[PDB]
Amino acid sequence: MILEAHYTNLKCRCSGVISTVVGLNIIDRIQVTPPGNGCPKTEVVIWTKMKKVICVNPRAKWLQRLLRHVQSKSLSSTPQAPVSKRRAA
């Protein structure tokens, strides 16, 4: 997912808020809308790859996982080999 941060002032149209957990693979873009003058509320607009415009609340706990995941680019390595010595022929 591409995290967008916009400060462009306009009448922000996002259809309410929905707490439906959206599929991480189909999540195209998560755009944060700060509580602007032309915008009615603080709105997080999730576009999907299927081109459905989904609106979610900024206080959604499942969303907070994603917001705290996208600020972690440096993962831990894998020393743990998932392939041990298998049986011979």
Which architecture would the CATH scheme give at its second level?
Answer: Beta Barrel
In CATH, the topology is named OB fold (Dihydrolipoamide Acetyltransferase, E2P)
Please work out how many helical segments DSSP would assign.
1
β-sheet strand percentage: 15-25%
Q: Class by helix and strand content?
A: alpha+beta
Cα-to-Cα separation, first versus last residue = 45 Å
Tell me, briefly, the overall form: elongated
CATH class, named Mainly Beta
Structural domains: how many: 1
Give the C-alpha Rg. Answer: 19 Å
SSE series: EEEEH
User: Helical content, roughly?
Assistant: 10-25%
Largest sheet: 4 strands, mixed
DSSP strand count:
4
Walk across the major sheet and give the strand order.
1-2-3-4
Task: Describe the structure in brief.
It contains one helix and four strands; from the N terminus they run ββββα. It has 89 residues and is α+β, with helices and mostly antiparallel strands.
